[PDB]
Amino acid sequence: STLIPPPSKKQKKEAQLPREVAIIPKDLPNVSIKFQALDTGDNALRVPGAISEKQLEELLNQLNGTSVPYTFSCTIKASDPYSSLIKPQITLLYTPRAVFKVKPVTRSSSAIAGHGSTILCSAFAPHTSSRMVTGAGDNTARIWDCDTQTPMHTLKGHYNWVLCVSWSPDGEVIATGSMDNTIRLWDPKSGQCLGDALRGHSKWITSLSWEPIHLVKPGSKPRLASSSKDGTIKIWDTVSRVCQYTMSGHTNSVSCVKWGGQGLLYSGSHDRTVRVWDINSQGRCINILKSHAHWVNHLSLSTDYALRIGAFDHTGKKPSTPEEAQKKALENYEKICKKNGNSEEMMVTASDDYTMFLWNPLKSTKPIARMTGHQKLVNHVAFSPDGRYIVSASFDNSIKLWDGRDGKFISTFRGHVASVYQVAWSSDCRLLVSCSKDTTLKVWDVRTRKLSVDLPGHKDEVYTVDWSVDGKRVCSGGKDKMVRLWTH
Amino acid sequence: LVVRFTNKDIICQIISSTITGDVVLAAAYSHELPRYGITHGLTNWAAAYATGLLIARRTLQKLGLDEEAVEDGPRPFKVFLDIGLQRTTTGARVFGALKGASDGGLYVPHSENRFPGWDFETEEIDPELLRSYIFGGHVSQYMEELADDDEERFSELFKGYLADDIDADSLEDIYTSAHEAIR
Amino acid sequence: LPVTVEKPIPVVYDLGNLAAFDSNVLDKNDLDSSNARREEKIKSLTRDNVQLLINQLLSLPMKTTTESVGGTGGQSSVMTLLQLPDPTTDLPREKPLPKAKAMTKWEKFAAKKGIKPKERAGKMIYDEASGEWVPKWGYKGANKKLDDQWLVEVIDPRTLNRAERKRLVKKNEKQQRRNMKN
Amino acid sequence: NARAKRALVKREAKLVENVKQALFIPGQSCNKNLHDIMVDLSALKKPDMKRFNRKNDIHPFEDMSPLEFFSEKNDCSLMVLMTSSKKRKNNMTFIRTFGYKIYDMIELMVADNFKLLSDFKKLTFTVGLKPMFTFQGAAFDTHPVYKQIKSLFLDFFRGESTDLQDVAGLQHVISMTIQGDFQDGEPLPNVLFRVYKLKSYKSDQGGKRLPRIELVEIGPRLDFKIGRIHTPSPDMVTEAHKKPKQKKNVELDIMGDKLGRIHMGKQDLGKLQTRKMKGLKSKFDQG
Amino acid sequence: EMFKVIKTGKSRSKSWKRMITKHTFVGEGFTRRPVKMERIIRPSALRQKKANVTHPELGVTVFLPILAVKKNPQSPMYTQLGVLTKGTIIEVNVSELGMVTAGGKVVWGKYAQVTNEPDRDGCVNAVLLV
Amino acid sequence: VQPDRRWFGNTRVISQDALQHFRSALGETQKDTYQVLLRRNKLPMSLLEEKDADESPKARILDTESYADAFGPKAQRKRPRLAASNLEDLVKATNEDITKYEEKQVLDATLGGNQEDKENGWTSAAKEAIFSKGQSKRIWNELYKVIDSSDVVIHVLDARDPLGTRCKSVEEYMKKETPHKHLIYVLNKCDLVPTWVAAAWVKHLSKERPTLAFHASITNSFGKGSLIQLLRQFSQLHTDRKQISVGFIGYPNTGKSSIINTLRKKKVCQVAPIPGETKVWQYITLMKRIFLIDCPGIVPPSSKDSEEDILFRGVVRVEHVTHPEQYIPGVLKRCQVKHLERTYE
RNA sequence: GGUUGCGGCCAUAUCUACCAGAAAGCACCGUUUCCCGUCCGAUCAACUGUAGUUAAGCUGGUAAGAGCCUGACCGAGUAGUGUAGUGGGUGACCAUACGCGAAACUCAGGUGCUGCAAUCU
RNA sequence: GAGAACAGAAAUCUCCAGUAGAACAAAAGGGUAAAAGCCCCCUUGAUUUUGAUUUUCAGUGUGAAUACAAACCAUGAAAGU
Ligand SMILES: [Mg+2]
């Protein structure tokens, strides 16, 4: 075991003396401080004393008339959120917090037996963290009782690998995609298959996307969008289980499809092209984006989190009526969408060309900004729950953070020793769990841009990781065939 | 975390160390289970698991982890289980209380070599058997077996179950509801 | 509410032992056993000293690891521990230094000659004419093979070999005793 | 077999000595109150607390052999002997041993105003935590008797030495205060022993890093009167205070890089008379 | 063999010298001593820095730096000399393979055994001892 | 070979915290010329490198389209890729590109003098073999041998043109392959330059290496004491080595033999104004602990070393040059008229 | 005040012989399908609290029971020991102080308290 | 000590005593208690690598032993050892 060099005798002598008392008697600011909304609003050059964080929060609350805490950041150089009073017009930039705190995850629970093959995918239920479903190489899929950490309501009927598994935003239906050219819908509370398996695809399903609740008709059930390696996408109606519209604009395998909050569908394909499709216009393409040199992998949107957990929140409270659920989903979508002062959603496209592009498909067809610097292909990209930051995973063992507002690079989360497959954002946006080909999982804290804790214990490569809506539990799955649950 | 089992009752207590004597920070007993709807088998495996979960969640809530604090983070409450003179045998309901406490948020460092269903031929825990034991599956199986065996024993044993009109699946449902109420 | 402490003489701290020394004057009358308020003055002085010591201790740097439980010796990432410096106060040792020295009459020759220390590879040694290693010593040693073998061509020679082993062991013990005599 | 070899190795001296064990010997004249005081005081010394089985007729100042024999047999470097007499009531004699040889002895007598743990406020305490020390009075750092008292108490109550400490372990503080300053010709003021439970509160006068500290005495409260004193010889003092010992211009830079300084000397370019090349000389010209 | 007698002087009759004609690892601080002092000679052209190690799992092989030589059979005096002598176990920089043991203690070094004879080959091949 | 759990044992395992600390140290630590490295403290440098970058080298286009697809009998690339989206953009990017190409062609033609050879059909004469020294195989082999056999390398420089004589080629290899070698500079021939010139040279060169000034002569000299003290200090640093070897690197006729001779205070190494006096390295002992080594003059090949630049240095013997007359304008340019008018009649 | 759990002091807490215990809880008890281990379901593991018993455990009360414990000018500031002086004694010793400083014995008393959580007519 | 076909003064079994006149590596303070004793299950270690003493003849920025320290290892549910 190689050890850090020990301190010298001079270091010991220096440390033996007292110093660094935090009396801070007066610390009267030399320059006035003003509050400005981070988004667009400037709100007033005050000259207060050594006011604490609570005092600043109270001042902002009484300015807003709520005396809703906001996180105070200095001028973005310093870029440091009395915290900033040590460095000395000064402007303090604040953003809504959406008060919540996900307890850091540092311990596992147990190693659970199950599928006799590597785990492939997982997804926590949008409404409760007590139930979760994992897809694995074994043809069967199993739902796990996250409380007791035991299998429950095993899904059977498939005859090939369960490539992808997704949970409906309403939490009433589970959609599972397998290497076989079929998709099956299952009741989470019984495991029964909802009618005959969806069929019509010529090749295995690559990804699944559920229609957002706020766009669905009041009282009706959401549709299910699916993508296949053949390059075609079908919009399946969960009621009739029949694909109303088939789209095959992509000339190669479709990497994934994302259902935007505006009703448009954005998908990446192996043809090095990104296409925007509108469900309203009888499922017809509207625009084509051509900037990636290599194929596009894992297209993502800023609103993905809200759409996934539409009508729900970290508290897990369920809606009473369909109208209330739709209203809550619309409010949740607007909260992130209207952060710019106008209804807009950002889209980030990743590709194996060592570059990622930021797009506003509705506003303009040109890329807003180009994110570059990775040494290898970017496997995974995950927008923050509020769109504040963009994080991407690459095979070069490095994870990079980019500003979600303009795509500017922020920092690189170093520490991984193997290719990073996928990452999942925390509900409060404070933490970020990540998995890599190496033997251990890792979680990063965006606030300090530093590693939070290493989570070893997996016996082989880990391909799947997800964070619960409430943030209480984190699941994972890998080549070891053992499903692991992690929580504070 | 001191867990002791007596006749008709289960005693679980979180205990610290002091010169004047041990001090209890929180305590729970099986006789409080009826508060959550559990009326029979207060000293059984499922009751032990429920009591462990209840005490763990209660102490977690009292400590402020849910719903000199300097030097973040919250420093989760780690506790070591103590069973006194209770024998170390795989499947013992004491290990069931340990599992319940672990599920409740108390991170007791423990291996799965003594949970029910742990086979010696293969070093793997059978989660189905553990779930059955947690949800009183063994009790329901015994009731089903007695349903076609001599009725005198079935009328003496499980007499409370017959009085309350309990059945095989109703026992598991009651245990799940009791766990939810405890939470 | 106030936490700052001011004294005519600065307090001398010993962070390696969590100790603080106060040389300030003390009033004999106030601390006299006959005074009812005797306890209050001592309590206030101790409170001030403890406040100063706590401030100094919290002013020290603290470790912050990113590992997990794993080896129970290491601290969890959630925990952070103050790095106390080495003790400043000198305390007497309970026993003298064990730095006894003796060449045993072997190190002297090994230094005089060019005999380098043996590499100390291991017990394992290849036993020819067989498909097993059977280490030189430690378990089923080959040295015991002569006793278990069947023909000892050229009084039982096995007893002679055992006597030779006993003689060598006794010679080693006698050499150890001779070196201890020095 | 070799089971006792591990115990002998543990007893054997090392470059880093183990935690000193405290042996409490109940004297022949030891009284019930003295026994209770000894038990209360030793409760803070756990897990290094040891109590003898039977009462012992010990006269340390008349014959120190019994103390050395007890230390050798029990391998306890710290010893406290209870003694009670009409002249010396509640006499608690503390003894230190260096290699089983008596290092120093100091007689401490507890005044009748002592308060036991039971009589204090009903508050709890954590066993095994390192106590904090606060010495009051310049005599501790200047008076030989009080210097010896300070050293003995530090060696007794400090517990195990560690370079890393947890904040949660700072639960209680042990305070020793002298009953006022004194000069020559006056009896040595009694030493006041107090133990205070620590409490933390928000201050707002510096933030979380400077919390307000409140105290709650839990005792045991003891007032020690200085009796007979014995001191070690200078040779023993030097031997006990001896570092195990187990480089110029060489510094282990960060990352373990071993760097050596060059330390170039001054260069006097005023020397080195430039070669008088024919070109520089003005004796030859062609203008 | 492997010790070619090298003769020095105008009248070559006082060789006193030995040259290692096989590939050898000489560490990082080699720094040849004065001619008059050196007896065993290992030419620089025969000094290897990076060895080819094949991973038994995944069938992947990588070119990694050599760290040290631990156990060379046949009079391990050669181990002290650092000769490869196929059959020797040498330390390799496994950091590239990203091997991580339980507990988060990523392994950047591990043992490996050379599988090819460097005398007849211009490269070093070893099998990783997983 | 006996089986064991070692060999399949764990030896060098590192922890994440140590990796983070070393990563921070890499960017925090800075080197000082007055300090020299003694031990590298073997570390997984691979896990600490790969600092942040914003280039993202060109993607592997061949993977998306093979060579046959781009062109050939099949040639499925029926259309250009990412071509200009509009005719106006094409015109804008082509009209200016034509002017840029014309300007670049004019700039290149300003130099061509190969145009004379192309037109008149004549060719330049073969480069004289004398101008190719010192670049033989033997001299470079001796240089490498002394470098490997010297714990410290002392580089001599000519005060007249130290930068030209720096011969950076060897220094890069010294820094990369052998960090432990000090590679200390020495400003020789300071007695032939103005004092302020030498002072400025040492001031500007001291920012990277010690660069001790020296004048070499068996008779009265300068810097002998300072260099001896420096060598003694370096030997003291390697106290446990039992010896230290120092090698003299530099251009031919730079005074390496003279430096060694004055250090020995007697005639030890053959010295002559003609370069290449020392043909093979030799060991010289002083103080019983440090040994001096002098290697032949080494010159790194480079097309920018046109014979005029090489000749004015002490690299080449002027005897073998075919036409010494054509070099007089160069010495006129390199020297003021006053100095020649004084020295020359 | 009884009681269960975790303990501190560790015989005023122990040992022998006798007697009671309202409610609750310990305790015995009833069962071997499951987890579990034994030659033995005796021990232990699990189920049952259902068919009972306060017989036993445990708590409490008694013996001028055996031991045990405490305060003490009772021994006692006594014995013993130590240091000093032409005090007497030729010296050793005798008388004094001058500092430590006992115990048997004896007088009188007693035969469990107490820290935290929970529960009971 | 009370009892059991051969079986008695010594064969093996059941019960009540045993402060331990059990075997404890130790003499021995007199210690060791739901053990340091007895019955049963799993287990290699002369593992490496960093630092201060020792040695030499490519003084080996390491080739080795010694001491310390850190990883690793055995066991248990765990504290821990
Ligand atoms: Mg020359």
* List of residues 6+ apart from B24 with CB closer than 8 A: B13, B14, B15, B16
The β-bridge relationship of strands A198-199 and A182-186 is antiparallel
Helix axes F224-237, F256-264, angle to 10 degrees: 80
Q: Which chains touch B (3 or more CB pairs under 8 A)?
A: A, C, D
User: Does the beta-carbon distance from D254 to A8 stay under 8 Å?
Assistant: no
Chains B and A touch (3+ CB pairs under 8 A): yes
- Residue A472's identity, in one-letter code, is K
Q: Which chains touch C (3 or more CB pairs under 8 A)?
A: A, B, D, E, F
> In whole angstroms, what separates CA D119 from the centre of its chain?
29
Residues 41-80/F with CB < 7 A to strand H: 41-42
Residues A355, A369 contacting (CB under 8 angstroms): no
Q: What is the DSSP letter of A171?
A: S
Alpha-carbon distance of D66 to A242, in angstroms, equals 98
Alpha-carbon distance of F26 to A76, in angstroms, equals 26
Alpha-carbon distance of E65 to C11, in angstroms, equals 56
Q: Which of C77, C118, C119 has the most E C-beta neighbours within 10 Å, making it the best mutation to test the interface with E? A: C119
**Nearest CA-CA partner of E15 in E23, E25, E4, E24:** E4
Alpha-carbon distance of A7 to D163, in angstroms, equals 12
Each domain of chain A, given as residue ranges in start order, spans 107-487
CA–C1' distance D150–H3 (Å)? Answer: 71
Dihedral angle sign, alpha carbons of residues E52, E55, E56, E58: negative
**Nearest CA-CA partner of A144 in D197, B130, C15, C135:** B130
Q: Which residues of F are annotated as a binding site for GTP?
A: 250-257, 294-298
- Residue F275: cis peptide before it, omega within 30 degrees of 0: no
- Intra-chain end-to-end CA distance of chain A, in Å: 29
Say yes or no: D164 contacts chain F, CB-CB below 8 A. no
Which residues on D lie below 8 Å from B18 (Cβ)?
Answer: 124-127
- Residue F134: cis peptide before it, omega within 30 degrees of 0: yes
Whether D32 sits with its Cβ under 7 A from any strand H atom: the answer reads no
Q: A279: which 2 tokens?
A: 């469900």
F158: helix, strand or coil = strand
User: Does the beta-carbon distance from B109 to C72 stay under 8 Å?
Assistant: yes
Q: Which residue has the tokens 């920089």?
A: E93
Residue A441's DSSP bridge partners are A455
Rg (CA), chain D: 30
The β-bridge relationship of strands E50-54 and A70-73 is unpaired
- F134 CA distance to ligand 1 centroid (A)? 12
Nearest to F151 among E31, E89, E101 (CB): E31
Q: Which residue has the tokens 């090994």?
A: C110
Neighbours of C133 (CB within 10 A): 14
Say yes or no: B160 contacts chain A, CB-CB below 8 A. no
**Burial tier of C24 (Cβ tally within 10 Å: 0-12, 13-18, 19+):** middle
Whether E69 sits with its Cβ under 7 A from any strand H atom: the answer reads yes
User: Does the beta-carbon distance from D207 to A5 stay under 8 Å?
Assistant: no
Neighbours of F171 (CB within 10 A): 17
- Residue D242's identity, in one-letter code, is K
Whether D16 sits with its Cβ under 7 A from any strand H atom: the answer reads yes
User: Does the beta-carbon distance from B102 to A114 stay under 8 Å?
Assistant: no
Kindly report the backbone phi and psi dihedral angles of residue A234, in degrees, each rounded to the nearest multiple of 5, phi listed first.
Answer: -120, 135
Q: By CA distance, what is A401's nearest residue in F? A: F52
Sheet strands (E) in D111-221: 132-136, 164-166, 172-178, 191-201, 212-217
- Intra-chain end-to-end CA distance of chain F, in Å: 84
Distances (CA, A) of F174 to D96, F149, F164: 62, 13, 18
Alpha-carbon distance of D23 to D21, in angstroms, equals 7
D99: helix, strand or coil = coil
Cα atoms in the Cβ-side hemisphere of radius 13 Å centred on C86: 11
Chain G positions with an atom below 7 A of a protein C-beta are 4-10, 12, 25-31, 33-37, 44-51, 69-73, 76-77, 100-103, 114-118
Sheet strands (E) in B45-171: none
Alpha-carbon distance of C161 to C144, in angstroms, equals 10
Distances (CA, A) of A403 to A341, A386, A397: 18, 12, 20
Alpha-carbon distance of A198 to A415, in angstroms, equals 43
Neighbours of B66 (CB within 10 A): 12
DSSP C31-88: H-TT-TTHHHHHHHHHHHHHHHHHHHHHTS-EE-----SSSTTSPPSS--EEE-----
Give the largest Cα separation in chain F, rounded. Answer: 88
Q: C103: which 2 tokens?
A: 């060449």
Alpha-carbon distance of D22 to D71, in angstroms, equals 10
Residues A26, D205 contacting (CB under 8 angstroms): no
Say yes or no: B6 contacts chain A, CB-CB below 8 A. no
**Nearest CA-CA partner of D43 in D268, D162, D177, D219:** D219
Neighbours of F115 (CB within 10 A): 10
Q: After which residues is chain A discontinuous, taking C to N > 2.5 Å? A: 43, 67, 76, 81, 88
Residues D163, D120 contacting (CB under 8 angstroms): no
Q: By CA distance, what is C66's nearest residue in F? A: F17
The CATH code for residues A107-487 is 2.130.10.10
* List of residues 6+ apart from A348 with CB closer than 8 A: A299, A300, A301, A302, A356, A357, A358, A359, A371, A381, A383, A390, A392, A407
Nearest to D257 among F40, F226, F234 (CB): F40
Which residues on A lie below 8 Å from E103 (Cβ)?
Answer: 456
Q: What is the DSSP letter of A222?
A: P
Q: F204: which 2 tokens?
A: 């500007």
Q: Which of B53, B75, B103, B129 has the most A C-beta neighbours within 10 Å, making it the best mutation to test the interface with A? A: B103
Closest nucleotide to D27: CA versus each C1': G102
Alpha-carbon distance of F221 to F255, in angstroms, equals 13
Q: Which chains touch E (3 or more CB pairs under 8 A)?
A: A, C, F
b/e sequence C80-108, b meaning 16+ C-beta within 10 Å: bbbebbebebebbbbbeeeeeeeeeeeee
Residue A486's DSSP bridge partners are A108, A474
A469: helix, strand or coil = coil
Q: B178: which 2 tokens?
A: 């009791």
* List of residues 6+ apart from D103 with CB closer than 8 A: C92, D95, D96, D97, D232, D236, D240
Q: Which chains touch A (3 or more CB pairs under 8 A)?
A: B, C, D, E, F
Whether E75 sits with its Cβ under 7 A from any strand H atom: the answer reads no
- Residue F315's identity, in one-letter code, is V
**Chain F (20-59) residues lying within 8 Å, Cβ to Cβ, of chain C:** 20
Give the resolution to one decimal, in Å: 3.4
F248: helix, strand or coil = strand
Residues C58, A445 contacting (CB under 8 angstroms): no
Distance from CA of A106 to the nearest CA of C (A): 7
Alpha-carbon distance of A157 to B130, in angstroms, equals 26
Cα atoms in the Cβ-side hemisphere of radius 13 Å centred on D122: 1
Q: C65: which 2 tokens?
A: 């690891």
Neighbours of B58 (CB within 10 A): 17
* List of residues 6+ apart from F82 with CB closer than 8 A: A290
Distances (CA, A) of A350 to A267, A302, A358, A380, F50: 11, 14, 9, 8, 21
**Nearest CA-CA partner of C69 in A480, A149, A487, A453:** A453
Q: What angle do CA D184, D185, D190 make, to 5 degrees?
A: 85
- F139 CA distance to ligand 1 centroid (A)? 14
Dihedral angle sign, alpha carbons of residues D139, D144, D146, D152: positive
Alpha-carbon distance of D203 to D192, in angstroms, equals 30
Strand (E) or helix (H) holding D33: helix D32-43
Q: F253: which 2 tokens?
A: 């006729």
Alpha-carbon distance of F232 to F230, in angstroms, equals 5
CA–C1' distance A209–G36 (Å)? Answer: 50
Which domain range does residue F194 map to? 137-294
Alpha-carbon distance of A309 to D145, in angstroms, equals 74
Strand (E) or helix (H) holding E3: strand E3-6
**Nearest CA-CA partner of A268 in A282, A247, A288, A254:** A254
**Nearest CA-CA partner of A175 in A217, A144, A205:** A205
Which contacts (CB < 8 Å, 24+ apart) does range F260-263 have? F260/F284, F260/F292, F260/F294, F261/F216, F261/F218, F262/F216, F262/F217, F262/F218, F262/F221, F262/F224, F263/F224, F263/F227, F263/F228, F263/F292
Alpha-carbon distance of F38 to D257, in angstroms, equals 7
- Residue A69: cis peptide before it, omega within 30 degrees of 0: no
List the alpha helices (DSSP H) in B5-71.
Answer: 45-62
CA–C1' distance D91–G101 (Å)? Answer: 14
Output the 3-class SS for A72-141.
EECCCCCCCCCCHHHCCCEEEEEEECCCCCCCCCCEEEEEECCCCCCEEEEEECCCCCCEEEEEECCCCE
CATH number at residue F274: 3.40.50.300
User: Does the beta-carbon distance from A8 to D204 stay under 8 Å?
Assistant: no
- Residue E82: cis peptide before it, omega within 30 degrees of 0: no
Alpha-carbon distance of A220 to E69, in angstroms, equals 72
Which residues on E lie below 8 Å from F181 (Cβ)?
Answer: 31
Residues in chain F: 345
**Nearest CA-CA partner of A348 in A225, A464, A260:** A260
Alpha-carbon distance of F174 to C15, in angstroms, equals 48
Say yes or no: B130 contacts chain A, CB-CB below 8 A. yes
- F217 CA distance to ligand 1 centroid (A)? 13
Whether E10 sits with its Cβ under 7 A from any strand H atom: the answer reads no
Q: F123: which 2 tokens?
A: 């060719």
Residues F257, F269 contacting (CB under 8 angstroms): yes
* Residues of chain B in Cβ contact (below 8 Å) with chain C: 70-71, 73-76, 109
CA–C1' distance A106–H45 (Å)? Answer: 33
Whether D70 sits with its Cβ under 7 A from any strand H atom: the answer reads yes
> In whole angstroms, what separates CA A182 from the centre of its chain?
27
Q: What angle do CA B86, B89, B93 make, to 5 degrees?
A: 70
Alpha-carbon distance of D257 to D242, in angstroms, equals 31
Residue lying closest to nucleotide H64, CA to C1': C119
| Helix, strand, coil % over all residues of chain D, rounded to 5 | 25, 30, 50
